């Protein structure tokens, strides 16, 4: 089973910053979103490692185009706060990580 994990982790913050980058890359907002919580973390050792993550994003006040220090909305109907698990499949000593699944929906 998945083991308690942390974003101090080297790992985890590289598969959060992958899933993060996944979901902007998918959605058809102009801005960008970005993880104003990681909720819960955790993993498995695999064939490689699993990834679980629980992350809720909020909209930022920058286009996708043009770092991430851009603002995270103040108005709530702005902001469109969602809750998201992630599963990332990494096999770091291959060079490879995977989205195995994303799920999202408003908070």
Same mark, same amino acid.
């Given at each position: 089973?998945?083991? #308690?994990?942390?974003?101090?982790?080297?790992?985890?913050?590289?598969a /959060?910053?992958?899933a993060?980058?996944? &979901?902007?890359?998918?959605?058809? #907002?102009? &801005?960008?979103?970005?993880a104003? *919580?990681?909720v819960?973390?955790?993993?498995?050792?695999?064939?490689?490692?699993? &990834?679980?993550?629980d992350?809720? /994003?909020?909209?930022?006040?920058?286009?996708?185009? *043009?770092?991430d220090?851009?603002?995270?909305? #103040?108005?709530?109907? /702005?902001?469109?706060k969602?809750?998201?698990?992630? *599963?990332? &499949?990494?096999?770091?000593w291959?060079?490879?990580?995977t989205?195995?699944?994303?799920?999202? *929906? #408003?908070?």
């Open positions: 089973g998945p083991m #308690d994990a942390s974003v101090e982790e080297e790992g985890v913050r590289r /959060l910053d992958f993060v980058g996944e &979901y902007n890359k998918a959605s058809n #907002d102009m &801005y960008h979103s970005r104003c *919580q990681v819960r973390a955790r993993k498995q050792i695999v064939a490689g490692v699993n &990834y679980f993550l992350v809720e /994003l909020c909209r930022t006040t920058c286009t996708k185009t *043009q770092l220090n851009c603002p995270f909305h #103040d108005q709530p109907h /702005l902001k469109r969602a809750f998201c698990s992630f *599963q990332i &499949y990494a096999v770091p291959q060079g490879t990580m989205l195995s699944k994303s799920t999202c *929906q #408003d908070a």
